[PDB]
């Protein structure tokens, strides 16, 4: 951050944030390109993967900068342009989590993207390390959250839904719908089990049905379904909480 001995000092910590802001804008523009299109081709799915990997590495670098309660770097990031990058990634996550999850051909992209979300939340926690009551970093982060309230609301609804999925699958109704251990459960069976759950609204029901993938036998593997959707939901939700 500060080369004390040198005559001229360059803030590598802030240059990292500048590159993060540029790669965020690139990812956001590429998302805006693919949002209208129903399907993402192989080339686009590869470009997303490479960009997400780069952003993940940058987030890890920033986390390594700010951990070890390095207060100077914490304040530098707090007053830098990090907040715009984070608020853009929040929008990207909030909309891609509902776009990709519907289609079963971008599960790997969804995994990479929710890993990027985990790293961003980890960086936010590392910023919040060594906090004080009524701190400036807390003020900045709450202002960011207020700005991105809609995106965080959508993300939190997504996580609450896929965390209640576990209780739904642990319900006795589902246990008697699947007395045997195969678990390969029909689409209508899952739909009526959800209707019996009484914890899922109508819109939640259509979203689960859309995100639910079935074979030609019209029967679904709930074990793998709940794995894929619950486990990232669980860990990212824990970090957000």
């Amino acid at each position: 951050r500060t080369q004390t001995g040198n005559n001229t000092t360059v803030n590598i910590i802030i240059s990292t944030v500048d590159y993060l802001l540029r790669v965020q804008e690139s990812i956001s523009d590429f998302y805006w390109y693919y949002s209208g299109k129903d399907v993402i081709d192989e080339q686009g799915q590869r470009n997303f993967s490479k960009a997400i990997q780069v952003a993940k590495q940058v987030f890890n670098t920033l986390t390594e900068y700010i951990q070890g309660p390095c207060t100077g770097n914490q304040q530098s990031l707090a007053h830098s342009r990090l907040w715009d990058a984070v608020v853009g990634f929040l929008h990207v996550f909030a909309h891609m989590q509902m776009k990709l999850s519907q289609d079963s051909s971008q599960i790997e992209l969804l995994k990479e993207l929710m890993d990027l979300q985990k790293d961003m939340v980890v960086m936010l926690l590392s910023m919040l390390e060594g906090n004080v009551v009524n701190g400036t970093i807390g003020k900045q982060m709450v202002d960011m959250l207020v700005e991105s309230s809609n995106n965080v609301e959508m993300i939190l609804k997504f996580f609450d839904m896929f965390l209640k999925l576990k209780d739904l699958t642990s319900s006795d109704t589902f246990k008697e719908y699947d007395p045997d251990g195969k678990g390969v459960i029909s689409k209508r069976d899952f739909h009526k089990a959800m209707e019996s759950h009484k914890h899922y609204t109508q819109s939640e029901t259509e979203f689960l049905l859309s995100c639910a993938e079935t074979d030609e036998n019209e029967t679904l593997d709930y074990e793998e379904f709940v794995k894929r959707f619950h486990e990232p939901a669980k860990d990212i939700g824990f970090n957000v909480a």
Side-chain angles (χ1 to χ4, degrees):
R1 191 197 57 249
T2 49
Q3 289 95 41
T4 56
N6 291 319
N7 291 319
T8 300
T9 292
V10 175
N11 211 330
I12 298 300
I13 313 300
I14 302 300
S15 303
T16 314
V17 183
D18 300 318
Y19 185 78
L20 188 62
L21 188 146
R22 297 173 34 208
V23 67
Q24 180 274 336
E25 268 163 350
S26 295
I27 293 185
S28 280
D29 292 354
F30 197 73
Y31 162 70
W32 273 110
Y33 174 75
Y34 268 116
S35 86
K37 295 180 176 66
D38 176 53
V39 64
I40 292 141
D41 58 356
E42 190 277 331
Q43 268 306 109
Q45 189 175 2
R46 187 173 303 301
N47 287 306
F48 274 115
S49 301
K50 281 185 306 190
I52 288 169
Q53 184 179 2
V54 162
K56 189 190 159 63
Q57 177 54 53
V58 176
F59 269 124
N60 286 335
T61 302
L62 282 169
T63 303
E64 264 300 332
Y65 287 158
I66 61 173
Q67 287 181 355
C70 188
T71 50
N73 303 343
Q74 268 179 4
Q75 298 289 328
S76 81
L77 270 76
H79 295 117
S80 74
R81 288 206 72 196
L82 180 63
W83 303 130
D84 316 313
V86 181
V87 73
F89 283 112
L90 273 157
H91 171 276
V92 165
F93 296 153
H95 289 154
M96 301 275 263
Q97 267 177 357
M98 311 280 258
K99 176 184 148 74
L100 306 172
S101 52
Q102 283 196 82
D103 196 9
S104 46
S105 64
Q106 310 86 338
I107 298 169
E108 302 297 327
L109 204 74
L110 199 57
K111 289 158 181 161
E112 304 151 15
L113 188 69
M114 294 182 286
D115 207 322
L116 183 61
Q117 193 161 328
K118 201 205 171 44
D119 281 18
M120 178 181 81
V121 184
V122 163
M123 181 265 318
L124 294 180
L125 291 173
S126 303
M127 281 265 290
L128 273 189
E129 292 181 354
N131 211 26
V132 288
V133 171
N134 310 321
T136 176
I137 308 194
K139 295 291 186 290
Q140 299 295 321
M141 185 180 288
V142 178
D143 303 339
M144 182 179 72
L145 291 174
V146 167
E147 182 65 26
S148 61
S149 67
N150 296 112
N151 306 318
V152 190
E153 276 159 55
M154 245 183 326
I155 284 157
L156 283 174
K157 277 212 251 170
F158 186 84
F159 287 163
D160 178 52
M161 158 173 57
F162 274 131
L163 285 162
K164 291 172 70 176
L165 182 64
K166 175 57 64 62
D167 307 330
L168 160 72
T169 48
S170 296
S171 74
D172 289 330
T173 73
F174 186 77
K175 289 195 211 81
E176 53 88 19
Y177 293 142
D178 194 42
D180 57 357
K182 67 192 207 320
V184 176
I185 294 299
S186 89
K187 293 291 288 184
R188 301 314 89 199
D189 281 24
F190 206 70
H191 177 33
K192 64 182 175 66
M194 288 172 65
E195 294 296 328
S196 297
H197 190 194
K198 296 296 294 297
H199 278 133
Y200 272 101
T201 80
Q202 185 62 255
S203 178
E204 291 190 331
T205 312
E206 293 83 4
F207 191 75
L208 267 294
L209 290 151
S210 73
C211 283
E213 198 40 69
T214 189
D215 60 356
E216 72 275 16
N217 296 114
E218 196 69 24
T219 50
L220 173 148
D221 197 55
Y222 80 93
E223 290 89 1
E224 207 273 336
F225 177 55
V226 306
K227 188 183 108 162
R228 284 188 287 118
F229 283 111
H230 182 263
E231 310 323 306
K234 186 150 190 316
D235 66 359
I236 306 152
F238 182 73
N239 295 115
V240 165

